[PDB]
């Protein structure tokens, strides 16, 4: 609400768009980076910046003060989206497991690590910062882990003991699997035994992680410069990729946030963290398994350009 409060959001999103536009312009118009060089800037951002940035969000989580209702509310949204994606597909209006993972990656996996903290913190202050760290840990540890094992069922089933090992061979090498497993072994050791990182270790991690939230958008602009067409695939798959992340997604967190009885800041922060642009980690899997890679990208390169117009719509709605 208000008119100045609307400025605290535009002022917190523009910095994330100036970096995004300085990447797209540096790959299409300026012709500064060659296509193969653009894959090196993204690889460094996907293996050294994001994993190190997830260590500073997961480490400061206080696992001993994690709400049992919010955790049981995210577990309910995903289960209430499966029952919606496992029923709509039934009527289709077959290889349906292929079309489900594409629906569980476009709707219930928002970008909280990069866009969740800056945009939403500027909306609700520092009282909505710990409510998103609780999500980053769950998405990094469970949802991204329950999706990677759910992707492996399409590269094989098209038994099960040969799937978990085949999925565990891709987790033991994934950089984000060690930050999410060491960032929770340190948080449990720093908030209980009071073990604080030495200055050398702490600063050694900031040198790379500090420029990771602005670099994650520069790489995204570079990717948005790779896709020649702004909206790939027919428009019948571009309005269903935007009505599936900003309507069905949040409208099923409103059903789980009123059944688990979430109230107060914990409520208005959980329904707004869902109405955020789709994350790109799910797209990383898509290409790696060729599961509609061009249907998720359109949800990202177009889910980002409608990030501010729609965030203000749900922030206003949550204010009655």
Ligand X SMILES: O=C(O)COc1ccc(Cl)cc1
Ligand Y SMILES: CCCCC/C=C/C/C=C\CCCCCCCC(=O)O[C@H](COC(=O)CCCCCCC/C=C/C/C=C/CCCCC)COP(=O)([O-])OCC[N+](C)(C)C
Rounded-to-integer distance, Cα 9 and Cα 271, Å: 17
- Residue 51 sits in the site that holds ligand Y (CB under 6 A): yes
Which residues inside 275-304 make contact with ligand X, applying CB under 6 A?
Answer: 279-281
- Residue 18 sits in the site that holds ligand Y (CB under 6 A): yes
Query: Which entry of ligand X, ligand Y, its own copies, none binds 279, CB below 5 to 8 A by partner kind?
Result: ligand X
> With helix as H, strand as E and coil as C, how does 190-228 read?
HCCCCCCCCHHHHHHHHHHHHHHCCHHHHHHHHHHHHCC
Burial environment of residue 250 by CB neighbours within 10 A (0 to 12, 13 to 18, 19 or more): buried
* Tokens 């599936």 sit on residue: 244
Q: Is the dihedral of CA 249, 311, 295, 289 positive or negative?
A: negative
Structure tokens at 313: 């719509």
SS3 state at 110: strand
Q: What are the φ and ψ backbone dihedral angles of 201, each rounded to 5 degrees?
A: -65, -45
- According to DSSP, the residues that pair with 110 across neighbouring strands are 278
Stretch that binds ligand X, among 32-40, 79-87, 106-114, 146-154 (CB under 6 A): 106-114
- Residue 216 sits in the site that holds ligand X (CB under 6 A): yes
Structure tokens at 276: 């955020």
Whichever of 14 and 313 has its CB closer to its own copies, that residue is 14
- According to DSSP, the residues that pair with 278 across neighbouring strands are 110
Query: Which entry of ligand Y, its own copies, ligand X, none binds 38, CB below 5 to 8 A by partner kind?
Result: its own copies
Q: Pick the binder of its own copies from 215, 220, 296, 318 (CB under 8 A).
A: 215
Structure tokens at 161: 């003991």
Give how far Cα 169 sits from Cα of 75, 97, 265, Å.
26, 22, 40
Q: Check whether 300 is labelled as a binding-site residue.
A: no
Structure tokens at 212: 């990771």
Q: Pick the binder of ligand Y from 100, 101, 108, 179 (CB under 6 A).
A: 179
Other CB atoms within a 10 A radius of the CB of residue 297 amount to: 24
Query: Which entry of ligand X, its own copies, ligand Y, none binds 172, CB below 5 to 8 A by partner kind?
Result: ligand Y
- Residue 182 sits in the site that holds ligand Y (CB under 6 A): yes
Q: Pick the binder of ligand X from 219, 273, 310, 311 (CB under 6 A).
A: 219
119, 311 Cβ separation under 8 angstroms = yes
Q: Check whether 7 is labelled as a binding-site residue.
A: no
Q: Pick the binder of ligand Y from 1, 158, 161, 173 (CB under 6 A).
A: 173
Note the residues at the interface with its own copies (CB under 8 A).
10-11, 14-16, 18-19, 22, 26, 32-34, 36-41, 43-44, 47-49, 199-200, 203-204, 206-215, 217-218
Note the residues at the interface with ligand X (CB under 6 A).
42, 45-46, 50, 111, 113-114, 216, 219-220, 279-281
Binding site as annotated, residues: 50, 111, 113, 144, 280-281
Note the residues at the interface with ligand Y (CB under 6 A).
14, 18, 22, 30-32, 47-48, 51-52, 55, 172-175, 178-179, 182, 185-186, 197-198, 200-201, 204-205
């Amino acid at each position: 609400i208000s008119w100045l409060d609307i400025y605290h959001v535009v002022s917190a999103t523009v910095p994330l768009y100036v970096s995004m536009t300085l990447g797209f312009l540096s790959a299409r118009h300026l012709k500064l980076f060659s296509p193969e060089q653009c894959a090196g800037i993204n690889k460094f951002v996907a293996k050294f910046s994001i994993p190190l940035l997830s260590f500073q969000i997961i480490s400061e989580n206080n696992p001993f003060k994690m709400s049992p209702k919010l955790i049981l509310s995210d577990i309910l949204q995903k289960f209430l989206v499966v029952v919606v994606l496992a029923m709509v597909l039934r009527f289709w209006h077959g290889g349906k497991l292929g079309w489900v993972i594409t629906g569980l990656s476009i709707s219930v996996l928002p970008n909280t690590l990069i866009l969740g903290m800056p945009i939403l913190s500027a909306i609700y202050g520092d009282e909505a910062a710990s409510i998103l760290e609780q999500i980053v840990v769950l998405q990094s540890l469970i949802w991204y882990t329950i999706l990677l094992f759910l992707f492996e069922l399409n590269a094989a089933r098209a038994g099960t003991m040969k799937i978990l090992l085949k999925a565990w061979r891709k987790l033991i090498i994934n950089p984000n699997t060690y930050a999410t497993l060491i960032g929770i072994i340190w948080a449990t050791l720093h908030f209980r035994l009071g073990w604080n990182l030495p200055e050398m270790i702490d600063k050694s991690i900031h040198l790379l992680s500090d420029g990771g939230l602005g670099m994650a958008m520069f790489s995204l602009g570079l990717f948005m410069a790779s896709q020649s067409s702004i909206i790939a695939c027919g428009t019948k798959m571009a309005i269903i990729t935007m009505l599936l992340k900003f309507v069905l997604g949040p409208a099923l967190m409103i059903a789980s946030a009123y059944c688990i009885r979430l109230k107060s800041t914990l409520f208005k922060v959980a329904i707004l963290q869902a109405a955020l642009p789709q994350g790109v980690v799910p797209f990383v899997f898509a290409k790696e398994y060729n599961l509609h890679p061009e249907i998720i990208s359109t949800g990202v390169i177009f889910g980002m350009l409608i990030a501010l117009p729609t965030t203000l719509a749900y922030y206003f709605l949550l204010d009655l």
